[PDB]
Structure 1
Amino acid sequence: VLSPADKTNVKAAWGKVGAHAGEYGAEALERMFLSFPTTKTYFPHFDLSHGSAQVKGHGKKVADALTNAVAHVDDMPNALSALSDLHAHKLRVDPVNFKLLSHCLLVTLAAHLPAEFTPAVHASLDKFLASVSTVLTSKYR
């Protein structure tokens, strides 16, 4: 459960991501494909190479969805209902992989926003990303 202080930390830090969010999304995907190469089997028809335009456009989709989930942090299961359908029913993405992408987002944000990424904000972002990963897996059959 997100605290009012978690909601404030998440809203303020993601506010600073701002117009750099598609860029942060694509760096998070690049980090995950490099460090955790088994994750690449969900994207068999993608050009997953440095500077790839297919990954730049997917990075932008992922970050828009998080901007939406920050805006609807009180009603995320509703706001993310169609993503939950796609990831659990059509793609059958194993839950371990959501932890891997969450780590890569936190690493990206830590590298880009060092003054915003305090221990309190780190703890709030970890909670938010785990709650998004919860909705996106909460379905399946």
Structure 2
Amino acid sequence: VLSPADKTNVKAAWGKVGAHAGEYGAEALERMFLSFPTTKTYFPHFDLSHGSAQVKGHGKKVADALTNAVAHVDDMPNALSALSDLHAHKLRVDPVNFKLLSHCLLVTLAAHLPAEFTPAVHASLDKFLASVSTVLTSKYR
């Protein structure tokens, strides 16, 4: 569960992400494709090369969804509802993959936000990405 302190931590860190979000989501995806190749199976229709405009374009979409989750941190299950139907019922993405993307996001934020990624903030972000993953995954079978 996201406690008050966690929400504050998440708002402050995503805040400092600002207009770089799109770029971070794109790096997170590239990191995931390279470190965990099984995830590419969900994107055979994508151009997966370094610099791919499809990957940047998508990274932006992933970051906007997270920004909207942060904006609706007290009602994530409803705010991400459409994205849950998409992932669980249409794309049918196995839940382990969410853990992999999440890990890759944390890696990206760590590499770009040295001063903000303290122990406490790292724990809050991990918790937040778990909450998002759980919502996107709850109807899956």
Common topology (TM > 0.5): yes
CA RMSD of aligned residues (A): 0.6
Residue 106 of structure 1: aligned partner: 106
Deviations 1:83-133 (A, max 9, x none): 000000001100000000000000000000010000000000000000000
Q: 1:139, 1:75 → 2: CA distance?
A: 17
Q: TM-score, normalised by structure 2?
A: 0.99
Secondary structure of the residue that 1:15 maps to in structure 2? Answer: helix
Q: TM-score, normalised by structure 1?
A: 0.99
| C-alpha displacement of 1:72 | 0.2
| C-alpha displacement of 1:139 | 1.0
Residue correspondences, number: 141
Q: 1:128, 1:121 → 2: CA distance?
A: 10
Deviations 1:47-82 (A, max 9, x none): 000000000000000000000000000000000000
Q: 1:51, 1:89 → 2: CA distance?
A: 30
Superposed, 1:1-141 pairs within 5 Å as: 1-140=1-140
Q: 2:20, 2:54 → 1: CA distance?
A: 18
Secondary structure of the residue that 1:129 maps to in structure 2? Answer: helix
Consecutive unaligned residues of structure 2, counting only runs of 5 or more, are none
| C-alpha displacement of 1:140 | 2.6
Q: Runs of 4 or more off by more than 6 Å in structure 1?
A: none
